Amino acid sequence: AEIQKRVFDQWYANGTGPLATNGIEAGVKIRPTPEELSQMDESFQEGYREYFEDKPDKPVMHYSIIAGFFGDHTKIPPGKYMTMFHFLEYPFSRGSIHITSPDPYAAPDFDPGFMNDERDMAPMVWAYKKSRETARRMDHFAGEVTSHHPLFPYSSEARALEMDLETSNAYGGPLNLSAGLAHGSWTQPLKKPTAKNEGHVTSNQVELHPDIEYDEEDDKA
Amino acid sequence: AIPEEFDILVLGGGSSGSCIAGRLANLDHSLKVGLIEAGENNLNNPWVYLPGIYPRNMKLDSKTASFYTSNPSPHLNGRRAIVPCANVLGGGSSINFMMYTRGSASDYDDFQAEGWKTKDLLPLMKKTETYQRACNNPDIHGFEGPIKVSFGNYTYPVCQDFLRASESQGIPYVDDLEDLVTAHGAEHWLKWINRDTGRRSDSAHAFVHSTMRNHDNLYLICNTKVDKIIVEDGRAAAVRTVPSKPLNPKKPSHKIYRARKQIVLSCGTISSPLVLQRSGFGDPIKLRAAGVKPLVNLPGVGRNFQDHYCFFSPYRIKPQYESFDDFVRGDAEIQKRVFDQWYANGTGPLATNGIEAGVKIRPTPEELSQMDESFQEGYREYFEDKPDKPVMHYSIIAGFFGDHTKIPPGKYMTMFHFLEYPFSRGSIHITSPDPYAAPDFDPGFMNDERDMAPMVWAYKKSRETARRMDHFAGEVTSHHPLFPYSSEARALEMDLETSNAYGGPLNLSAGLAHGSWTQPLKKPTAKNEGHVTSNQVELHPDIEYDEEDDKAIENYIREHTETTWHCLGTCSIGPREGSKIVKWGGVLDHRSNVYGVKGLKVGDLSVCPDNVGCNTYTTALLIGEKTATLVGEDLGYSGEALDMTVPQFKLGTYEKTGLARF
Amino acid sequence: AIPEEFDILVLGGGSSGSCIAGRLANLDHSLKVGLIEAGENNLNNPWVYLPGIYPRNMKLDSKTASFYTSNPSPHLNGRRAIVPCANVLGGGSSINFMMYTRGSASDYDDFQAEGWKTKDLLPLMKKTETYQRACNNPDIHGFEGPIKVSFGNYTYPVCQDFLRASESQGIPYVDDLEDLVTAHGAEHWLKWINRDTGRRSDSAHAFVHSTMRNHDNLYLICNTKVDKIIVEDGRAAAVRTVPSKPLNPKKPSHKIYRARKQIVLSCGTISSPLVLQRSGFGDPIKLRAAGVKPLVNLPGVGRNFQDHYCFFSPYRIKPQYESFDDFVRGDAEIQKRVFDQWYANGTGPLATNGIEAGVKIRPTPEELSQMDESFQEGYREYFEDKPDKPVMHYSIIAGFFGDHTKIPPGKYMTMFHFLEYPFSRGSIHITSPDPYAAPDFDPGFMNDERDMAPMVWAYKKSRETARRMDHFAGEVTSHHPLFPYSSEARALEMDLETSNAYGGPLNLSAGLAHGSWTQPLKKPTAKNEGHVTSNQVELHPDIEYDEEDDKAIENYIREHTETTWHCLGTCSIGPREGSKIVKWGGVLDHRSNVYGVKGLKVGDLSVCPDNVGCNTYTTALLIGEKTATLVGEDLGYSGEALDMTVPQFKLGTYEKTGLARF
């Protein structure tokens, strides 16, 4: 209530503030490198030659960063988030739609055809890995929401890693009685990133999280 | 000043240890008794005696627990299970869930040890407790003991809701599920809470602090870790200790305490074998591999590690019902009101554990025929001719137990299950003579194939219970088995209306389905308008599982099974050469003496050669009373001297004395 | 575990039932006593023992009550009256208005049954209670009984205001309106509240929980609905029960409990005949029509249904005076303060029912001459030679009793009336052998023409009382009779100033008359400046009614008369062949035995062949004490054994013991 009040108050005052944006502030159009292509399904490699190779101005995937969680907040833990929003630019899949009766109110017979062509899978998988790597290299990054990520094998080194103990306590507040209560093993914690290079100028220092390697089980997930 | 020499030395002041030290100090007040404990003193600490705040002890940064790591296990799909245990005076009793549960009569008979049969131990069971509730079978309960048990001073309404649901499943209500005989039933669950004061009942306050406040022969030595036991001429003569916090590496310190008459080791199932191994008791090859000179050949030390294997399954409750979720999340106003009520008169949510009802169950012959062949055979071998042993337990918690920062907002109830007599076995062993060093630990969770079927069975059973409760409003998908997305067995979340209720009137995303992260619960069946209103019901569908569903549940168990903190067996009572139940060799005789040395007993849960069908505080107390008696007899005491009554002001019942709480 | 066979079985743990079960368990502690109850256990439930929250039990979605529907009635202008009753251990005593009221001496004499005369029952009346207030007639009150009665720990100022007003009407103040003789008077009204604890007094805590906490022979079986009673060789031998919630339709369950010595049926006036009818006791034609095989020809079962007929009339109070309206409406800060005071020391608004004063009245010969000829004749037949029987009761409630979402904001007081001895009669009968099935129900409210005049009379009387109270600030038009718009008898609302006071300083529509929804109260007469200030008054006008006004009041009664929850008579004591007061035939002999079977008694309000001039908890308790004594005698007990004293810690008065509340 209080945050909504302040956000509306600023907008009423002079039309500025969080109410005057969509929170979708940056994004990307991408094409695969020839090396990346060689790692994808043969079906999409062929699809790329047929559709994209002689059309150098067409992107294969888009994704952008949303300054919050887009989705149902009653089904995600408390705290603050950012969301990678991806979509496939030129799918090979096709669907159809047709009326069921002359009743104008009647629900149509609808087959959108999402992902029914095998060529459409590889770019999506590719984009998830790409945006995840982007996310882990952002200053904002503090962890991965396991319930809303691929269901990797539990002990895979590609698994989703949640915010650590200190961050959990920060979000839980000073009165919490269960932040960092690990019993149940519902999540696994992010490890500390690499240390800053003390021999560098402060504004060029970084703390890095590890790159992720995927095997076939991970890709399946 | 703390003397350097005592008559009796008790190592570890936990659930058993504090009881043993307190009893022995009252055996004869000319006897000097020293109690050594690694954790902090708990005297009048609100973070110990206030029941309702108990979950914070299992935060990973908790000061009141140690968190032992273990080796990766393929049976847990690669997990290195974390096994917590208490790190504070009072041990487990200072930080536990406060569930009161007794084993079955056959459990102690099956120890196969003279003097440890239920018939022998029954008066010691009664000796410990004051049973502060209605009793239809007073012959097997105590009413004068220093440990007070009760239903607390608050009951969440999940209690009778759960009992109605479980009854409809063929699990009969009983007045007392802890009658040492019943293995299939449901009850209102008792607590280790004194209803007169609204405080937690722990071994330190009951046996130690009471004694020290009225006598002079009991000494308390906390923040002190036991390194090893020193043997002189075949007698346990001294103990080497180090500070629990090594704060001066430039010049490390240590102390030596001597015992004239008796040493009792009570450091718990995880730690007691480590002490013995550091003292030169164990497998000579392994001891030498860890840099310790062998003294006594006892390969059983650290072997036969047993536990109960548990898992938690949370459910959505309707917005009008109560839970402790906001309280443990850290809501300031709700915490303030809860504490204010307790300060006022010792009642309210702070004076309960929220674990209000539960179940002991055995499979029907039909249910058995649907399970793994391996467990069917295990059932014939272990359970069929032991009709008083339960296979699974589960109970209802009036809130989510777990990390609230990793679950959505709202209110919950949690099914808490554990396996009563696992076939799996583990082991533990020191890595070096460093008393601080982490041991090599394999708890052995689920490594025997027979242990999987009962757990799967229990999940399905408790889920059916949950869906038949009035409280039920949905299933938390992220914390349930990863069913195939479109399976009719999948977890179904709270519906649109309920989501909006929890989201509040200003929400902008409740019921925003895009992303398909969850699927909604459908409307239940309509009330029968031809029935009397109080008999009308709204029913959710029964669930059918195929092989893919069952596969999901199995992986769920493998990935979220934990210790239930009921670890036992690492210093098993039995023949030194071994036995069918103690294959690696016994560690203690039937008088709890360590083989190969004089004047040394072990008195904690490491003692048990086989498991018990219960939360293990009753077992710890029983072992404590028994061990104290054994020591007393050994030192030549008899008759009323063995009473070892501790100081206590008895309040009885209100209608008799007018002093107890109405 | 709960035994399958008892010595004594009590069915229904209500106001009578809990009393009977508790007493009998203390008759002889070697006797196994089983108490079966359909509702939930009420042990230490704050929603039961906190007095001030009592209205929520009558919310239609309440868990603590059943809401029985009835057939449409032309006498109620087409209404199908809803008849609530308790659905919880303790029965009515767990959820009632807590009004303490005794009948007249002639009431029990007029039962025309041996051993049920007031002279016989008087020691049993005293036996139940501890009378925690000033007593000028201690010979007819008890001071050691387990049920404590008092004025609570808060008194709303409507008390003496009401008494001054009623005195000016010729209704004299008495120290005790419950002296079994006075039929025309006014008093400070007693409560079923223990002033020592500030808690409600109910039968379960007084008789059952106290006993179970100190003895082992009493067993409690809740959430269990009694289906039928099984007869073997002319003896009531067993009871078939089903769960109160049918949660498993695929395979419904049931239990059978056996009794060796005695079965007592105490399911209440509405439910007891249903149990008997399902057991084959009743009218063979009707039983067969309901699918039940007849066993005993007893056409009286379900007949002779009686009740008190009540209605509520709310009034505006001045903004400076107190009521429980904001509390009941759900104001957070006010609820917080009220609970905080109770937690602090058991005092404040939570420790009262807000029903502080009341009246028993008979018409003067002049008043009679103005009423219906039919009631004038009824008065000669029933009341004229019975000078101790009241005709109407009404009392003042310090707030609005009813749905606050359907009445304007502000503060209120409510006149609560009921008819003491209605001539109307109803009946009830099962529709099928299904224990859950709604019965065919005709309560018979107002179907006799003689019952209309007293109700009309009472409305006019209480309205006159209200208008002479200092609290009075207007009449709530929507909840009063629909007088002709311009009648001088019409309801007059609070005036402009008072409306603005309640509306607050920011209101934008208080006193906006457009629409003509209400008409305002005029200024009262001026104070007499020549009088001493404390004797000065401001008077509102007396009201004159014509035939159109009277017509409006009659329709008002027809449309808003309800059960007062005092239902009785469906298992009447009397000659099996019938009598003048039991026309359809008796169901029980003078020892409460059901005709045609051995070992079966009925012990609840269904027993009464004719009505009682009182709220019926005293009657329920009395029937309970009497029934317990009857059973005890039948089983061969005598003398002090028939005391059946239940466990209790007596506190007496403060000046004697120093233990009771000052």
Ligand SMILES: Cc1cc2nc3c(=O)[nH]c(=O)nc-3n(C[C@@H](O)[C@H](O)[C@H](O)COP(=O)(O)OP(=O)(O)OC[C@H]3O[C@@H](n4cnc5c(N)ncnc54)[C@H](O)[C@@H]3O)c2cc1C
């Ligand atoms: C969080 C939690 C919840 C639980 N819930 C329940 C429940 O609801 N009901 C129930 O019945 N049981 C419960 N249990 C289990 C509990 O009953 C334990 O089984 C019981 O405390 C075991 O008693 P001990 O064997 O004496 O070991 P304990 O762990 O109780 O005692 C060992 C003591 O020795 C000390 N120690 C260890 N190593 C040492 C060293 N080297 N030097 C000095 N001191 C050392 C420890 O600090 C500890 O105080 C719970 C346990 C935990 C941890």
Ligand SMILES: Cc1cc2nc3c(=O)[nH]c(=O)nc-3n(C[C@@H](O)[C@H](O)[C@H](O)COP(=O)(O)OP(=O)(O)OC[C@H]3O[C@@H](n4cnc5c(N)ncnc54)[C@H](O)[C@@H]3O)c2cc1C
């Ligand atoms: C809301 C309310 C307010 C009242 N106000 C007052 C007041 O202020 N003062 C006063 O004196 N009286 C009051 N009364 C009346 C009260 O005293 C009742 O008359 C009294 O409880 C009747 O006692 P019993 O005949 O024992 O029936 P009860 O209704 O008390 O007891 C019957 C019991 O049997 C159980 N039962 C019914 N059918 C069953 C079945 N098939 N199987 C198993 N169990 C079954 C019920 O759950 C109940 O517990 C009030 C009643 C109500 C409901």
Ligand SMILES: [Ca+2]
């Ligand atoms: Ca092309």
Ligand SMILES: [Ca+2]
């Ligand atoms: Ca066997």
Ligand SMILES: [Ca+2]
């Ligand atoms: Ca007459």
